[model samples]
Target: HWGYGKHNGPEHWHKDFPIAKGERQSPVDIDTHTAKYDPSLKPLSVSYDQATSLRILNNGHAFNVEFDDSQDKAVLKGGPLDGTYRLIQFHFHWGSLDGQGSEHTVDKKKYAAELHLVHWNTKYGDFGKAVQQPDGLAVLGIFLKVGSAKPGLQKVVDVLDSIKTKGKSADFTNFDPRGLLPESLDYWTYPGSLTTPPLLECVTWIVLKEPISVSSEQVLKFRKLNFNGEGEPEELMVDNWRPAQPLKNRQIKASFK
Candidate 1:
């Protein structure tokens, strides 16, 4: 029921989703100078089977690419996780205007956009059951800069025109999630929640240090999406990112110095 608008934004989320005020909220500001560099953190290991990619849909908030995760065909191991986390969905967050939109910021610098690849642990029976637990999710966050158009991401962009309205979906296949990542897997890890409501605190955030590139022209197309479905006076879907939350007692562990 909660949407990101003037009357119902992050500051107002606590009224409906009580967990919004919970200890481990997400999209925290990563103060690089203060982050702890842990040599013990293992390198990230991710494997995604292209065939597992199912469809792409405009969920009003963002365009999400879903995966067939009934099995462990695609998984993220290592990098602050104790067990395997299977890929489920991947989505993006962007700004209404340029130079802002990422949920997580580094040294207070906001990127043009941010991508989230959501995965759930096998320790739980299903995503429904796992999402309620502390160690249920592992979200890989990758920042997007406005520069060269990423060739690997072109396939994803091509389908945006078809799914511009809310609730619209189209069959999508053979897309590898690995191509959406940056070169360096070096990252910052911490316990956090989903950036959106229910705002569940089940995520072990693995935010990559390097940012991927997307063209400015293509980035604008993301704004063309509508928050309102079918008829209700179309609301442009932009600036869908939640602002940075307080770090509180959380320690940001980095994989590389």
Candidate 2:
């Protein structure tokens, strides 16, 4: 589950949740200079209509959005990890500030936020059932960097008005998640598990090294949404991310070189 406050976020994750110490984690750094996996890993080029309307939800922890994908055709291709999967839902993982947000770490360095573009096999029809299958899920990881102005992500930041108050949600008219992707698609590929608890090892992880940017103002607004509905009001409610874990010897294949 998402958490906030003192000794709660990713910094204290290993302590708060002891089971994390033994899981097969993702997005770890790979020395392409020495990696020996299949060299043909590439992100499937997805062609689809922009997500026109997105619905924001305050489902206990962090605000989530449901996008309408009626006419979209997210593409996939042959990679070292697995075959192509279609895009489903896109969500975010963040820290209260910079330095501790992204779900996966490279040599133990954490970033501001990580966006997951969730996709799965067409055999499952949708994300829910696809999650149950063995080779049915793929998540494209995009890291968010703080300090510089990330103009493209304004579509998501603009929706902060509706979710400013805890338990508040509304339909965000005319928003596209594609605007959020970084300029480069070249990524590190691997076979791994989900970032959240239950942390199933059923994911084809495609993590981009070049992160997109976000201002401190925007980052602060995101941290204000909602965490867990608990005791004090002074206690922040926005717990939008998961803690990082060890690699456990999973192979990381890169698209470049």
Candidate 3:
């Protein structure tokens, strides 16, 4: 029973998780050919992470405290955005469907999965407090596609070793998520709301256009998560993606200047 997959994907998601009417979901399909070329939108990087990474959740979600904070703080620390957003965690959303892994869509094209690099504004001190701020978070959306076997993500599946039972979690003391990113940080950014419940509207989403690759088997491994843990018979979540919402004429620009 795959709850999150292609055949019975988000379309079948119960009323328990009603779609957001005012949320700005990502992975939209923009006609790159017709989009006005803004020379200011150039790829830029403030900092990067070299240590610590994703910790596997029993629910099949891998939470990564990725992204470079020192660099981000130095650059984006005091911009007009106000909040000093630093990356705190990262995760993913996938489905059992082949062309339906992403959480947001542009013009209809969908990818295999979407990676969320979550950040918090430090003005309030600490991540939990930062998340409470109206301008408290900046989510970087990275797209993942199915293709020839890629090498970076297996480290996650490799550690599926720790959580073998529901409600169990093992510290992934030796994983780094920077390895999971694509070569390019070329991104399309927009001021939007959270894709999750509570649906907070204080987010600056930087979604990368280039997608990384993973093997079909690897994708399947992500698709099947035993909510009860590795050994338990009952799997809690097969997919964890939220349905995409309209951008509603929202202006999505890039930070590559």
Candidate 4:
């Protein structure tokens, strides 16, 4: 089973999933100084329908807030993206405590956690078909820092208790996900793959320069989750982030100076 633990950790993923070592892999260490500002890049645009909020679930890796992506209710456009990418789900990656987490790094520095807003290009017909194309998905990344409590984040935190274990779900409704973002949308765009296997090389990564704050209380709540099911040996779900891969033959473009 591919996971974040010892036997199936990122280091050993290439054995079963060879794409783990391929070019265009994600979570690259971003050298902000090296990022060329591209004026041609348009500002990102996001629109979400609050009623589209479905439910929360724990799936052994990380918890996810699934949404109604069947329609263009919640969608992302512009900013290194050619077409509208429908919002499918949102999830996060964090550490055991603090100081070290987040998949992509800024100046090789780690954030307390990271958030991923997953979207699929309708141009590919289905989410399944999109994964195999070079430009089939777009992921909006937000780095989380430890500081004041973000009430927006609290909306999601309040639901963690019901889905503390793997394969658990709870009805969550009317939660506006757009409230979770930082003030600025300045980001660095790169062509990369998913941090987890199948590790498909299909995502256009847009990592924001500004970070949102998360209280220590929320961080602990997320760490309390289990990667195993009720009948199995339960392990706390921490450090679910992937290490930075090589940025070979790739150029990161900034939306701002």
Candidate 5:
């Protein structure tokens, strides 16, 4: 019952996943004023081969587009990272309505949605093992704003109909994840946990300061997804976002001034 619903939603997550209440939990508010500018932070070097994109699956959580990380086919370097991290999968979190959904907020402002590109450190060998280490994972958080239709996101929206139900999947290829990023590479970095279940504190969050635009109609398609399987009562997939957490003693570093 660990999900984004009333009984199993984020508020009650700590009962099952104790880390949900941990000190370094994710989706914290980005207070730009409090973040310090780091001149030493290097620009992000991201390289993704379109051919490595394997498939997309709706695992009752979100539609995840997984990639082949057998080699360094799609890797992220620099930007608060000590070593190269292999891109494994990318997913999004959104709400049924407009103006709210994104996990991380800036100055307490919410976006229509948030995109997470999950990567694991090569040092840990695999994602399963890497997730337990403090420096095991790095995630890119890109916010989505309401505006004109995004031509780059059309391909992803077109497949929503095929994977409408939970557990459904479709072959998704010839897609380069890098094409979806915004123009600005400026970001805020911090150590945090996964936004979802098993909320492991292994992620090094790199949240982009700029937000990409998306048509209102395209966001409506995302709301049509069912959180339940075919035989069950359809639960609309919406508001799959975790609330912001306390910052505690950690400091947020910015790549740009």
Candidate 6:
């Protein structure tokens, strides 16, 4: 029902999702200067119990690569996380061009795109129920800088054409999520909500400090996705990211000084 347009975009989401104006919204500008070093914060860890991909789908706004979350095959721990958080699915948000696409900006600087690795707290049993809890999810936000080709992500980009329209999906797997991360694990942590509507404020934001590289041509594949499904009016799925929300005095902690 909600689309990223003049009539039904993020500004209009508050009508249906009252929490859209909630205290802790996500994708906040990571003012590195304001981030304090937390000696207590541990190194973020991602252990894929069995790094397997199921499929990739065009969920209208952005295409996500689905994973088998029945168990803690792939999980995130440490950092701002309390317990095991299973990796459910991963997606990306991009801009019309390479200048500004990332939802979370560093020192007000925008990247070409952002990659979100969605994980749910296993303490809640499953994502369906976890979505309702305060400490339910931990999303790893990795900014994508336009640079060069990465074989790990190039495989995912190659399948964008097959799932160009809404509700479209294809068999895509064998790509480990690790290859998408930058070498440095230094990150800024904060309390925030999902960037998407149903804008629930239940996430602990873990925005990475270093960004991974992706080619400009590779990002173009994401724009080919349509907001509308088959037989519906075609609307390019560009700028699917939400603008950075106010920090609202939320304390941001940095793993590195």
Which candidate number would show the highest lDDT if scored against the true structure? 5
Which residue pairs in candidate 4 have backbone atoms (N, alpha carbon, C) closer than 3 angstroms, thus clashing?
A: none
lDDT of 6 by residue, 73-190 (tens): 8989998789999999999999998898999998899999999999999999989899899899999999999898766788988888899898988998777888888889998999
Runs off by more than 4 Å, candidate 2: 1-23, 26-37, 50-52, 70-72, 75-84, 165-167, 229-234, 237-240
Clashes by residue pair, model 1: none
Instruction: Please give the CA lDDT of all the candidate structures.
Output: 0.91, 0.66, 0.61, 0.92, 0.92, 0.89
Residues 192-236 of candidate 4: C-alpha lDDT, one tens digit per residue: 999998999999999999999999998989998999888888799
RMSD of each: 1.0, 3.6, 4.6, 1.0, 0.9, 1.0
What's each prediction's TM-score? 0.98, 0.80, 0.75, 0.98, 0.98, 0.97
Mind giving the per-residue lDDT tens digits that candidate 2 earns over 169-208? 7886666666777788777777776766545666778777
Misplaced by over 4 Å in model 3 are 1-19, 23-37, 40-42, 59-84, 164-166, 228-233, 255-257
Count of backbone clashes, every candidate in sequence: 0, 4, 17, 0, 1, 1
Q: Name the candidate, 1 or 6, with the larger lDDT value.
A: 1
Ranking by lDDT: 5, 4, 1, 6, 2, 3
Compared with the true structure, what per-residue lDDT tens digits does model 5 show for residues 1-257? 88998888989999999988899999899998999999999999887753388888999989999998899989999988999999999999998778899999999999999999999999999999999999999999999999988888889999999999888999998887766889999999999999998999999999999999999998999999988988999899999999999999899999998
Superposed on all Cα atoms, model 5 deviates from the true structure by an RMSD in Å of: 0.9
**2 or 5: which has the higher TM-score?**
5
Q: Candidate 3: global Cα-lDDT?
A: 0.61
